[PDB]
Amino acid sequence: HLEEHLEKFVENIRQLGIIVSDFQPSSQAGLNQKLNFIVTGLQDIDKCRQQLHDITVPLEVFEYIDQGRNPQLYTKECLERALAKNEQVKGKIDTMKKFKSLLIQELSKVFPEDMAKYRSIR
């Protein structure tokens, strides 16, 4: 909340400094100076506000963010891959169950004793 607002203010100050550097010395150099000082003070205040919390950095999430993609792009692809994997193992298990049922029917046709005990097992 407040940290996002501070980051947005820092981005706006960066844009203003870039515009002042690009335009002309006419733009008050003291104005950009005070802007940079306020930006440093706000960065220190944001560090103080965010100095004891969370702790869960360990992921390629940074590579996906720096890989010209958001969490819905690379994260979406990862979630789709996980969904494909989970759907595939379910198909595996279902086909295994079907083959087992087929062989159970065949072994019941083979021996009544086996049918009688497949029934005790069930």
Binding site: E11, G68, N70, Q72, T75, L79, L83, N86, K90
Partner: protein
């Protein structure tokens, strides 16, 4: 128990491959939003919000105000 043989039936369980994480954790909405976004990026939003270094930022993430104001001189050219 004269028959012998005859071992234990497993007993039904809820953890199966059946339920996709879409249904298992009720993320069925996250997958739908992902498909919608794929049918429709962060770099695009950044280039739209601004005019248009990444390695230095990643490395940084992995790791007298009056005098500063006056020191302005000898620049802006």
């Amino acid at each position: 128990g004269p028959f012998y043989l005859m071992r234990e039936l497993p007993g039904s369980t809820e953890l199966t491959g059946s339920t996709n994480l879409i249904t298992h954790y009720n993320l069925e909405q996250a997958y739908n939003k992902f498909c919608g976004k794929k049918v429709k990026d962060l770099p695009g939003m950044i280039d739209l919000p601004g005019s248009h270094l990444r390695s230095l930022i990643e490395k940084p993430p992995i790791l007298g105000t009056m005098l500063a104001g006056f020191r302005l001189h000898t620049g802006p050219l």
